[PDB]
Amino acid sequence: GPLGSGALKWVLCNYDFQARNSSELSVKQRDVLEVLDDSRKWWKVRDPAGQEGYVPYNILTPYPAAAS
Numbered sequence: 001g002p003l004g005s006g007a008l009k010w011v012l013c014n015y016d017f018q019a020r021n022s023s024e025l026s027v028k029q030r031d032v033l034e035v036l037d038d039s040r041k042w043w044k045v046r047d048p049a050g051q052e053g054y055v056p057y058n059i060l061t062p063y064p065a066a067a068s
C-alpha cells in the first residue's frame with residue numbers, strides 16, 4: 001500500500017475541569033482535543049472552537065477508538 005504522512009494524536013477527556021486562570025482552558029467529559037505540548041504534567045491542547053490552553057494530563061486519556 002501507500003506510505004501516508006498525516007497521523008494526528010488526539011485525546012479524549014474522562015472528567016470535566018473548569019479552568020480560566022490566565023493561560024488555562026475549561027474541558028468536558030465529551031470534549032476531544034489535539035495535543036501540542038507534553039513536556040510537563042500541564043499538557044497544552046487545542047479545542048474545536050480555535051482557542052488553546054494548559055490542563056493536567058491526569059483527567060485526559062488516549063484515543064484508541066476501541067472499548068469493551
